[PDB]
Each structure stands twice: as C-alpha cells, then as structure tokens.
Amino acid sequence: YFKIYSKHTPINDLPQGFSALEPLVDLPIGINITRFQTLL
Amino acid sequence: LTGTGVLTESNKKFLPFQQFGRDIADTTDAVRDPQTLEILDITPCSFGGV
Ligand SMILES: *[C@@H]1O[C@H](CO)[C@@H](O)[C@H](O)[C@H]1NC(C)=O
Numbered sequence: 001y002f003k004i005y006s007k008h009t010p011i012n013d014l015p016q017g018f019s020a021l022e023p024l025v026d027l028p029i030g031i032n033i034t035r036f037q038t039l040l
Numbered sequence: 041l042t043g044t045g046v047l048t049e050s051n052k053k054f055l056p057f058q059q060f061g062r063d064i065a066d067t068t069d070a071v072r073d074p075q076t077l078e079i080l081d082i083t084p085c086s087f088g089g090v
C-alpha cells in the first residue's frame with residue numbers, strides 16, 4: 001500500500017516553477033514507515 | 041466496465057500509467073484496450089429527440 005512518483009529535468013538551491021510527477025510504481029507491501037534515510 | 045456505445049480509434053495522449061478517461065458527468069469517455077493498449081474513444085450510439 002505504498003506509492004513512488006517521479007520527474008527528471010535538466011536545469012540552469014531548489015529551482016522555482018512547476019512540476020507534475022507521474023507514478024513509477026504502486027508497491028502492495030503494507031510496511032509501517034515512520035523513518036527514512038538516503039544511500040550515497 | 042459495462043456500457044453501450046460506438047468504439048473508435050482516438051488521438052488521446054494517454055500517459056503510460058493511465059487506463060481510462062472520464063467526462064465531467066463521471067461517465068467513461070475513453071478506454072485503453074487490456075489485450076493490446078490502443079486508446080479507444082467511447083461515444084454514445086447515435087441519438088436525439090423525436
Ligand atoms: C508503526 O510503528 C510504531 C512503533 O515502532 C507505532 O507507534 C505506530 O503506531 C505504527 N504504525 C501504525 C500505522 O500503527
């Protein structure tokens with residue numbers, strides 16, 4: 001019961017203007033999420 | 041999705057995740073065919089007051 005959406009564009013610190021993100025996936029996983037982190 | 045109408049080819053630029061389209065009455069206006077993903081317009085069969 002989880003969603004991912006995304007968008008990806010070239011640019012000229014977050015840039016101004018408008019973005020609409022298409023869904024990549026719905027994942028039927030039902031996982032309890034309260035916390036997150038990023039891989040580098 | 042049961043219904044009755046004229047099915048046609050259509051130019052509607054369905055994004056790869058979109059499966060069907062709606063008119064403002066919530067009535068379905070187009071469908072992607074599930075066996076081969078062509079975008080079909082749906083129009084009511086020809087009608088009018090007599
Ligand atoms: C998720 O787990 C926390 C404890 O780790 C709990 O407080 C929370 O109620 C859980 N989420 C849901 C939707 O119950």
Ligand SMILES: *[C@@H]1O[C@H](CO)[C@@H](O)[C@H](O)[C@H]1NC(C)=O
Pocket residue numbers: 074075076
């Ligand atoms: C469904 O079956 C037909 C005939 O075998 C095939 O041409 C078509 O590509 C199939 N579509 C899907 C979504 O698998």
